[PDB]
Design a protein around this ligand. Structure first.
Ligand code: FES
Ligand code: FES
Lengths: 116, 118
């Protein structure tokens, strides 16, 4: 698993190869990436990260082509929420708490403001 | 993968053992096992093979691994969109509507429902 860490407080992004252990925060701290860690109960929100999934499904769980979405819409089997979710122009980022995020086999771009 | 086919036109559901393949479709599995899902086009544009799929194993809400606590913390900092909140707050296992001729059989166990109407 390849993780690219990025922050306005880092002049260079950091490419990290991660192995089984494990949280995003744990991986970051182990590799000198200073994601703010301000609680031991996962309630403060200081470790907030913006994650872009680099490989795998573009929209997680949404394997539908434009054609299938149109066919499903025509029979009233495509909810507006699912339509809008798939119609996103730019690769959708997910906000997570790094102290709660388990490192999987997925390649990620991990962004954080650097502010406490 | 285990697939359970169910329809108002079938007095009994049909449990099927299928093999995951990049070219293997839900409709192909159904036809091979005598499950009469309507098949009316070769282009995936007619909508006859419409199925309601319940993912029996794996992630409850595909791509959402967030705990209730994390969802609450993210909401408090305005980093949980209303659409993602409602999607995770669903009380019943969320069913997905698909065209069986377009659905690729993976390792995931499924409940596959269809009306039986052409
Ligand atoms: S360090 Fe407090 S929520 Fe992650
Ligand atoms: S058979 Fe026509 S959409 Fe599947």
């Amino acid at each position: 698993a390849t993780i690219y860490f990025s922050s306005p407080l880092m002049p260079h992004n950091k490419k990290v190869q991660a192995v089984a252990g494990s949280t995003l925060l744990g991986v970051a701290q182990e590799n000198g990436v200073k994601i703010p860690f301000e609680c031991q109960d996962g309630n403060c929100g200081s470790c907030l990260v913006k994650i872009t999934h680099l490989d795998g499904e573009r929209i997680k769980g949404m394997l539908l082509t434009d054609k299938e979405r149109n066919v499903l819409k025509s029979v009233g089997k495509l909810p507006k929420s699912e339509e809008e979710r798939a119609a996103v122009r730019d690769l959708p980022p997910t906000y997570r708490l790094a102290c709660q995020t388990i490192v999987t086999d997925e390649d990620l771009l991990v962004e954080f403001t650097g502010e406490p």
